[PDB]
PDB file of C-alpha atoms and ligand atoms in Angstrom:
ATOM      1  CA  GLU A   1     -27.938  37.602 251.398  1.00 27.79           C
ATOM      2  CA  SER A   2     -25.138  36.510 253.728  1.00 25.61           C
ATOM      3  CA  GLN A   3     -22.667  33.620 253.575  1.00 23.72           C
ATOM      4  CA  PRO A   4     -23.811  30.210 254.876  1.00 24.35           C
ATOM      5  CA  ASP A   5     -21.661  28.538 257.540  1.00 22.74           C
ATOM      6  CA  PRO A   6     -18.854  26.281 256.281  1.00 23.35           C
ATOM      7  CA  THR A   7     -19.718  22.701 255.396  1.00 22.80           C
ATOM      8  CA  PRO A   8     -17.631  19.959 257.067  1.00 24.84           C
ATOM      9  CA  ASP A   9     -15.757  19.143 253.860  1.00 23.79           C
ATOM     10  CA  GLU A  10     -14.672  22.606 252.756  1.00 22.56           C
ATOM     11  CA  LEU A  11     -12.644  23.689 255.800  1.00 21.55           C
ATOM     12  CA  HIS A  12      -8.867  23.466 255.416  1.00 21.16           C
ATOM     13  CA  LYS A  13      -7.253  20.861 257.663  1.00 19.40           C
ATOM     14  CA  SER A  14      -3.832  21.660 259.114  1.00 22.16           C
ATOM     15  CA  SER A  15      -2.923  17.972 259.070  1.00 20.42           C
ATOM     16  CA  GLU A  16      -3.101  18.218 255.274  1.00 17.22           C
ATOM     17  CA  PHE A  17      -0.680  21.130 255.052  1.00 17.05           C
ATOM     18  CA  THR A  18       2.883  19.839 254.899  1.00 17.99           C
ATOM     19  CA  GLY A  19       4.547  23.224 254.485  1.00 19.88           C
ATOM     20  CA  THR A  20       5.895  25.453 257.256  1.00 24.59           C
ATOM     21  CA  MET A  21       3.120  26.963 259.381  1.00 23.12           C
ATOM     22  CA  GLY A  22       5.556  29.694 260.369  1.00 21.72           C
ATOM     23  CA  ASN A  23       4.798  31.336 257.025  1.00 22.86           C
ATOM     24  CA  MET A  24       1.145  31.733 258.097  1.00 23.26           C
ATOM     25  CA  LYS A  25       2.077  32.803 261.633  1.00 27.20           C
ATOM     26  CA  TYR A  26       4.302  35.475 260.074  1.00 27.06           C
ATOM     27  CA  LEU A  27       1.308  37.276 258.537  1.00 26.06           C
ATOM     28  CA  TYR A  28      -0.397  37.748 261.910  1.00 28.92           C
ATOM     29  CA  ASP A  29       2.233  37.838 264.666  1.00 30.07           C
ATOM     30  CA  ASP A  30       2.687  41.518 265.602  1.00 30.14           C
ATOM     31  CA  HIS A  31       2.709  42.084 261.856  1.00 30.04           C
ATOM     32  CA  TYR A  32       0.845  44.867 260.085  1.00 29.96           C
ATOM     33  CA  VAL A  33       0.953  48.045 258.054  1.00 29.01           C
ATOM     34  CA  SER A  34      -0.719  51.033 259.661  1.00 29.14           C
ATOM     35  CA  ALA A  35      -0.977  54.575 258.309  1.00 27.62           C
ATOM     36  CA  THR A  36      -3.018  57.637 259.211  1.00 28.81           C
ATOM     37  CA  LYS A  37      -4.439  60.330 256.940  1.00 29.26           C
ATOM     38  CA  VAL A  38      -2.634  59.323 253.753  1.00 28.21           C
ATOM     39  CA  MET A  39      -3.568  59.663 250.085  1.00 27.96           C
ATOM     40  CA  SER A  40      -2.534  57.423 247.187  1.00 29.97           C
ATOM     41  CA  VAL A  41       0.252  58.823 245.040  1.00 27.63           C
ATOM     42  CA  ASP A  42       0.252  56.239 242.255  1.00 29.10           C
ATOM     43  CA  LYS A  43      -1.142  53.030 240.721  1.00 24.75           C
ATOM     44  CA  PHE A  44       0.587  49.954 239.286  1.00 23.52           C
ATOM     45  CA  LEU A  45      -2.332  48.098 237.723  1.00 19.77           C
ATOM     46  CA  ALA A  46      -5.995  49.166 237.445  1.00 18.31           C
ATOM     47  CA  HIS A  47      -7.157  47.459 240.662  1.00 14.91           C
ATOM     48  CA  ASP A  48      -4.481  48.838 242.989  1.00 14.71           C
ATOM     49  CA  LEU A  49      -3.347  51.967 244.814  1.00 17.68           C
ATOM     50  CA  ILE A  50       0.194  52.917 245.846  1.00 18.17           C
ATOM     51  CA  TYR A  51       0.898  54.736 249.118  1.00 20.21           C
ATOM     52  CA  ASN A  52       3.970  56.361 250.601  1.00 19.15           C
ATOM     53  CA  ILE A  53       4.120  54.590 253.955  1.00 16.62           C
ATOM     54  CA  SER A  54       7.358  53.823 255.747  1.00 17.32           C
ATOM     55  CA  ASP A  55       7.348  51.766 258.921  1.00 14.35           C
ATOM     56  CA  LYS A  56       9.324  53.875 261.373  1.00 14.24           C
ATOM     57  CA  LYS A  57       9.656  50.532 263.158  1.00 13.13           C
ATOM     58  CA  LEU A  58      12.036  48.123 261.373  1.00  7.73           C
ATOM     59  CA  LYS A  59      12.027  50.319 258.233  1.00  5.62           C
ATOM     60  CA  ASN A  60      11.544  47.534 255.662  1.00  2.00           C
ATOM     61  CA  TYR A  61       9.500  49.657 253.267  1.00  2.00           C
ATOM     62  CA  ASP A  62       8.630  53.183 252.172  1.00  2.00           C
ATOM     63  CA  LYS A  63       6.046  52.276 249.529  1.00  2.00           C
ATOM     64  CA  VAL A  64       2.929  50.151 249.973  1.00  2.00           C
ATOM     65  CA  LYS A  65       0.750  48.727 247.214  1.00  2.00           C
ATOM     66  CA  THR A  66      -2.725  47.600 248.160  1.00  2.00           C
ATOM     67  CA  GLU A  67      -4.898  45.773 245.660  1.00  2.00           C
ATOM     68  CA  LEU A  68      -8.674  46.053 245.678  1.00  2.00           C
ATOM     69  CA  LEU A  69     -11.490  43.949 244.212  1.00  2.00           C
ATOM     70  CA  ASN A  70     -11.949  46.207 241.159  1.00  2.00           C
ATOM     71  CA  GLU A  71     -11.353  49.638 239.552  1.00  2.00           C
ATOM     72  CA  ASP A  72     -14.500  51.092 241.087  1.00  2.00           C
ATOM     73  CA  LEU A  73     -13.280  50.461 244.639  1.00  2.00           C
ATOM     74  CA  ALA A  74      -9.852  51.821 243.772  1.00  2.00           C
ATOM     75  CA  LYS A  75     -11.385  54.975 242.302  1.00  2.00           C
ATOM     76  CA  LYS A  76     -13.547  55.439 245.387  1.00  2.00           C
ATOM     77  CA  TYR A  77     -10.494  55.794 247.661  1.00  2.00           C
ATOM     78  CA  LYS A  78      -7.896  57.063 245.179  1.00  2.00           C
ATOM     79  CA  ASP A  79      -8.218  60.759 246.024  1.00  2.00           C
ATOM     80  CA  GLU A  80      -9.550  60.690 249.586  1.00  2.00           C
ATOM     81  CA  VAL A  81      -7.586  61.099 252.818  1.00  2.00           C
ATOM     82  CA  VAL A  82      -7.662  57.603 254.319  1.00  2.00           C
ATOM     83  CA  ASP A  83      -6.410  55.389 257.133  1.00  2.00           C
ATOM     84  CA  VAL A  84      -4.735  52.067 256.374  1.00  2.00           C
ATOM     85  CA  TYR A  85      -4.493  48.840 258.347  1.00  2.00           C
ATOM     86  CA  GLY A  86      -3.608  45.423 256.994  1.00  2.00           C
ATOM     87  CA  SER A  87      -1.278  42.449 256.761  1.00  2.00           C
ATOM     88  CA  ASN A  88       1.565  42.904 254.272  1.00  2.00           C
ATOM     89  CA  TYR A  89       3.741  40.430 252.360  1.00  2.00           C
ATOM     90  CA  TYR A  90       6.943  40.632 250.311  1.00  2.00           C
ATOM     91  CA  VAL A  91       7.299  37.408 248.350  1.00  2.00           C
ATOM     92  CA  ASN A  92       5.820  37.832 244.877  1.00  2.00           C
ATOM     93  CA  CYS A  93       5.280  41.530 245.620  1.00  2.00           C
ATOM     94  CA  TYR A  94       6.159  43.696 242.615  1.00  2.00           C
ATOM     95  CA  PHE A  95       5.321  47.088 241.119  1.00  2.00           C
ATOM     96  CA  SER A  96       7.390  49.689 239.250  1.00  2.00           C
ATOM     97  CA  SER A  97       8.011  52.990 241.044  1.00  2.00           C
ATOM     98  CA  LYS A  98       9.118  56.512 240.123  1.00  2.00           C
ATOM     99  CA  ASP A  99       9.947  58.959 242.917  1.00  2.00           C
ATOM    100  CA  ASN A 100      12.765  60.626 244.853  1.00  2.00           C
ATOM    101  CA  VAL A 101      13.942  61.083 248.444  1.00  2.00           C
ATOM    102  CA  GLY A 102      12.965  57.476 249.074  1.00  2.00           C
ATOM    103  CA  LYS A 103      13.740  54.015 247.717  1.00  2.00           C
ATOM    104  CA  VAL A 104      15.637  53.171 244.530  1.00  2.00           C
ATOM    105  CA  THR A 105      12.580  53.942 242.399  1.00  2.00           C
ATOM    106  CA  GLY A 106      11.202  50.531 243.306  1.00  2.00           C
ATOM    107  CA  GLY A 107       8.415  48.958 245.321  1.00  2.00           C
ATOM    108  CA  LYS A 108       8.655  47.669 248.886  1.00  2.00           C
ATOM    109  CA  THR A 109       5.660  45.781 250.300  1.00  2.00           C
ATOM    110  CA  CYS A 110       2.162  44.589 249.327  1.00  2.00           C
ATOM    111  CA  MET A 111      -1.295  44.058 250.844  1.00  2.00           C
ATOM    112  CA  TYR A 112      -5.007  43.869 249.968  1.00  2.00           C
ATOM    113  CA  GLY A 113      -7.795  46.243 251.008  1.00  2.00           C
ATOM    114  CA  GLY A 114      -7.366  47.705 254.482  1.00  2.30           C
ATOM    115  CA  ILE A 115      -8.733  51.152 253.618  1.00  3.03           C
ATOM    116  CA  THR A 116     -11.146  53.375 255.522  1.00  2.00           C
ATOM    117  CA  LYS A 117     -11.990  57.056 255.138  1.00  2.00           C
ATOM    118  CA  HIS A 118     -10.387  59.060 257.966  1.00  2.00           C
ATOM    119  CA  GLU A 119     -13.057  61.791 258.088  1.00  4.16           C
ATOM    120  CA  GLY A 120     -15.979  61.114 260.404  1.00  6.17           C
ATOM    121  CA  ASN A 121     -14.763  57.593 261.166  1.00  5.21           C
ATOM    122  CA  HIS A 122     -13.590  58.099 264.777  1.00  7.14           C
ATOM    123  CA  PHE A 123     -15.358  58.265 268.153  1.00 11.07           C
ATOM    124  CA  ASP A 124     -15.761  61.478 270.140  1.00 12.52           C
ATOM    125  CA  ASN A 125     -13.450  62.216 273.063  1.00 13.74           C
ATOM    126  CA  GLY A 126     -10.796  59.985 271.524  1.00 12.79           C
ATOM    127  CA  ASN A 127     -12.613  56.892 272.767  1.00 14.81           C
ATOM    128  CA  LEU A 128     -11.690  53.394 271.591  1.00 18.16           C
ATOM    129  CA  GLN A 129     -14.185  50.646 270.799  1.00 17.80           C
ATOM    130  CA  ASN A 130     -13.845  47.224 272.406  1.00 19.73           C
ATOM    131  CA  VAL A 131     -14.998  44.312 270.248  1.00 16.87           C
ATOM    132  CA  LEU A 132     -15.782  40.953 271.854  1.00 18.14           C
ATOM    133  CA  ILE A 133     -14.419  37.758 270.359  1.00 20.71           C
ATOM    134  CA  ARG A 134     -15.971  34.466 271.484  1.00 24.39           C
ATOM    135  CA  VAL A 135     -13.751  31.464 270.868  1.00 22.85           C
ATOM    136  CA  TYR A 136     -15.201  27.985 270.494  1.00 24.11           C
ATOM    137  CA  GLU A 137     -13.013  24.915 270.766  1.00 21.89           C
ATOM    138  CA  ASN A 138     -14.636  21.653 269.674  1.00 23.35           C
ATOM    139  CA  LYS A 139     -18.045  23.334 269.953  1.00 26.07           C
ATOM    140  CA  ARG A 140     -17.308  24.700 273.436  1.00 25.83           C
ATOM    141  CA  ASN A 141     -16.951  28.382 274.399  1.00 27.81           C
ATOM    142  CA  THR A 142     -13.626  28.141 276.222  1.00 27.26           C
ATOM    143  CA  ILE A 143     -12.565  31.794 276.313  1.00 27.90           C
ATOM    144  CA  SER A 144     -13.794  35.245 275.338  1.00 28.83           C
ATOM    145  CA  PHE A 145     -11.555  38.257 274.799  1.00 29.45           C
ATOM    146  CA  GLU A 146     -11.626  41.812 273.503  1.00 27.31           C
ATOM    147  CA  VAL A 147      -9.709  43.703 270.821  1.00 29.91           C
ATOM    148  CA  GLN A 148      -9.866  47.449 270.274  1.00 28.69           C
ATOM    149  CA  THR A 149     -10.167  49.839 267.372  1.00 27.82           C
ATOM    150  CA  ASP A 150     -10.502  53.606 267.092  1.00 27.70           C
ATOM    151  CA  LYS A 151     -12.632  53.320 263.940  1.00 27.70           C
ATOM    152  CA  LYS A 152     -16.458  53.346 263.740  1.00 25.59           C
ATOM    153  CA  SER A 153     -16.460  51.426 260.457  1.00 26.02           C
ATOM    154  CA  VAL A 154     -13.440  49.114 260.549  1.00 25.48           C
ATOM    155  CA  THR A 155     -12.227  46.585 257.983  1.00 27.55           C
ATOM    156  CA  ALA A 156     -12.930  42.969 258.837  1.00 28.85           C
ATOM    157  CA  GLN A 157      -9.230  42.568 258.060  1.00 29.04           C
ATOM    158  CA  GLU A 158      -8.131  44.780 260.950  1.00 31.67           C
ATOM    159  CA  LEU A 159     -10.308  42.901 263.433  1.00 28.50           C
ATOM    160  CA  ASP A 160      -9.199  39.516 262.035  1.00 27.82           C
ATOM    161  CA  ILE A 161      -5.512  40.458 262.380  1.00 26.74           C
ATOM    162  CA  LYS A 162      -5.957  41.608 265.979  1.00 28.18           C
ATOM    163  CA  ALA A 163      -7.934  38.471 266.851  1.00 29.29           C
ATOM    164  CA  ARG A 164      -5.271  36.130 265.461  1.00 28.12           C
ATOM    165  CA  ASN A 165      -2.450  38.117 267.039  1.00 25.60           C
ATOM    166  CA  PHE A 166      -4.047  37.464 270.416  1.00 27.11           C
ATOM    167  CA  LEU A 167      -4.759  33.794 269.666  1.00 26.26           C
ATOM    168  CA  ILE A 168      -1.196  33.199 268.460  1.00 25.37           C
ATOM    169  CA  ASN A 169       0.221  34.531 271.740  1.00 24.24           C
ATOM    170  CA  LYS A 170      -2.408  33.102 274.100  1.00 22.24           C
ATOM    171  CA  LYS A 171      -3.403  29.805 272.432  1.00 22.99           C
ATOM    172  CA  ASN A 172      -0.528  28.950 270.088  1.00 21.74           C
ATOM    173  CA  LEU A 173      -2.915  29.247 267.130  1.00 22.82           C
ATOM    174  CA  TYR A 174       0.029  28.927 264.753  1.00 25.18           C
ATOM    175  CA  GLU A 175       3.445  27.557 265.665  1.00 28.92           C
ATOM    176  CA  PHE A 176       6.579  27.280 263.566  1.00 28.58           C
ATOM    177  CA  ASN A 177       6.049  23.711 262.367  1.00 30.39           C
ATOM    178  CA  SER A 178       2.297  23.238 262.749  1.00 27.38           C
ATOM    179  CA  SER A 179      -0.749  24.142 264.837  1.00 27.18           C
ATOM    180  CA  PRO A 180      -2.467  22.505 267.793  1.00 29.74           C
ATOM    181  CA  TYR A 181      -5.708  22.976 265.838  1.00 30.57           C
ATOM    182  CA  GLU A 182      -7.100  20.937 262.933  1.00 29.57           C
ATOM    183  CA  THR A 183      -9.639  23.392 261.532  1.00 29.57           C
ATOM    184  CA  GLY A 184     -10.501  26.976 262.306  1.00 26.07           C
ATOM    185  CA  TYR A 185     -12.628  29.749 260.899  1.00 27.52           C
ATOM    186  CA  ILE A 186     -13.471  33.250 262.033  1.00 28.96           C
ATOM    187  CA  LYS A 187     -17.098  34.260 261.628  1.00 29.53           C
ATOM    188  CA  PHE A 188     -18.502  37.788 261.546  1.00 27.85           C
ATOM    189  CA  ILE A 189     -22.156  38.485 262.405  1.00 25.03           C
ATOM    190  CA  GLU A 190     -23.399  41.944 261.487  1.00 24.37           C
ATOM    191  CA  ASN A 191     -26.193  43.870 263.186  1.00 19.91           C
ATOM    192  CA  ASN A 192     -28.451  43.267 260.166  1.00 17.69           C
ATOM    193  CA  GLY A 193     -27.952  39.519 260.489  1.00 18.13           C
ATOM    194  CA  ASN A 194     -25.529  39.329 257.548  1.00 17.83           C
ATOM    195  CA  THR A 195     -22.731  36.812 258.150  1.00 12.21           C
ATOM    196  CA  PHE A 196     -19.434  35.796 256.538  1.00 12.36           C
ATOM    197  CA  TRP A 197     -16.367  33.795 257.561  1.00 14.46           C
ATOM    198  CA  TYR A 198     -12.724  33.193 256.651  1.00 13.38           C
ATOM    199  CA  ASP A 199     -10.854  29.900 256.838  1.00 12.62           C
ATOM    200  CA  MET A 200      -7.904  30.348 259.214  1.00 12.92           C
ATOM    201  CA  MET A 201      -5.909  27.374 257.909  1.00 13.59           C
ATOM    202  CA  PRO A 202      -3.677  27.151 254.818  1.00 12.03           C
ATOM    203  CA  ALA A 203      -4.793  25.250 251.707  1.00 12.94           C
ATOM    204  CA  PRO A 204      -3.522  21.633 251.551  1.00 10.41           C
ATOM    205  CA  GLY A 205      -0.076  20.962 250.112  1.00 11.59           C
ATOM    206  CA  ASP A 206       3.600  21.524 250.874  1.00 10.73           C
ATOM    207  CA  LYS A 207       3.653  25.258 250.139  1.00  8.81           C
ATOM    208  CA  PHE A 208       1.811  28.308 251.410  1.00  7.69           C
ATOM    209  CA  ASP A 209       1.253  31.219 249.037  1.00 12.06           C
ATOM    210  CA  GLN A 210       0.890  34.298 251.236  1.00 10.59           C
ATOM    211  CA  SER A 211      -0.234  36.516 248.360  1.00 13.20           C
ATOM    212  CA  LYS A 212      -3.055  34.136 247.405  1.00 13.30           C
ATOM    213  CA  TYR A 213      -4.242  33.686 250.977  1.00 14.86           C
ATOM    214  CA  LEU A 214      -4.386  37.435 251.735  1.00 14.43           C
ATOM    215  CA  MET A 215      -6.293  38.165 248.525  1.00 12.44           C
ATOM    216  CA  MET A 216      -9.537  37.415 250.397  1.00 13.11           C
ATOM    217  CA  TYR A 217      -9.154  40.865 251.967  1.00 12.04           C
ATOM    218  CA  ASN A 218      -9.337  42.658 248.598  1.00 11.72           C
ATOM    219  CA  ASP A 219     -13.062  43.337 248.997  1.00 13.18           C
ATOM    220  CA  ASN A 220     -12.177  45.931 251.660  1.00 15.53           C
ATOM    221  CA  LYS A 221     -15.175  44.677 253.646  1.00 16.00           C
ATOM    222  CA  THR A 222     -15.945  46.934 256.613  1.00 16.99           C
ATOM    223  CA  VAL A 223     -18.198  46.425 259.634  1.00 17.93           C
ATOM    224  CA  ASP A 224     -19.695  48.595 262.376  1.00 17.12           C
ATOM    225  CA  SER A 225     -17.278  48.090 265.293  1.00 17.68           C
ATOM    226  CA  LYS A 226     -19.947  49.083 267.794  1.00 16.95           C
ATOM    227  CA  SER A 227     -22.331  46.246 266.904  1.00 18.31           C
ATOM    228  CA  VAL A 228     -20.437  43.442 265.152  1.00 20.42           C
ATOM    229  CA  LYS A 229     -20.202  40.028 266.816  1.00 24.23           C
ATOM    230  CA  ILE A 230     -17.215  37.759 266.164  1.00 24.80           C
ATOM    231  CA  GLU A 231     -16.758  34.032 266.755  1.00 24.07           C
ATOM    232  CA  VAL A 232     -13.694  31.885 266.238  1.00 23.45           C
ATOM    233  CA  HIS A 233     -14.488  28.193 265.777  1.00 25.73           C
ATOM    234  CA  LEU A 234     -11.610  25.794 266.306  1.00 23.46           C
ATOM    235  CA  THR A 235     -11.302  22.001 266.478  1.00 22.61           C
ATOM    236  CA  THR A 236      -8.342  19.902 267.624  1.00 21.87           C
TER     237      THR A 236
HETATM  238 ZN1  LIG B 301     -11.404  45.464 236.780  1.00 22.05          ZN
HETATM  239 ZN1  LIG B 302      -8.198  58.323 261.073  1.00 20.96          ZN
END
């Protein structure tokens, strides 16, 4: 069983968000944690995994905590060599640390999901997979573009991040104060017909909780990059 399309009344409307859209833009504008062939070295709470990942670019962190849907998922990846890709946040990000030759025995940055096994998850000959994104504006297919990934089974999160990064730079998806769009959702259609979507707009109100918004990625949902179909539905 897949997820039914969004009803008219459940989609978040940007006009109803009176906070600063820049806080949403932040999460997707050339913003992401990426690591290759790493293994967790610790755990804060039962549902999370701690990794030693330092962004050689900007160097804002050396420790990354990613929270999963439950202990079973965490245990599945805990001792495997994995690849990581996701959107991180700092506000309300906390977890005690104990190590040396790094930070002051403290945390650094947080995220949800974003984990894929490294072994057997890449294409031969170092090929990259192009994934097509069809964008619909007011029920009209205005533009289509491609994003790439080197993973066979990639997290929906990675594809979502790359799709929004493009849209932010090419269509001003999110601006500092607001957005030119009223509603927007990204829909994934799998080869087996299964479908699911994420609301691209912040919940109504004057504040945006980045931690709460990103939590949707904690299911570590992955899709076959070779066959998945993606659609972005926007309205002005
Ligand atoms: Zn649990
Ligand atoms: Zn890999």
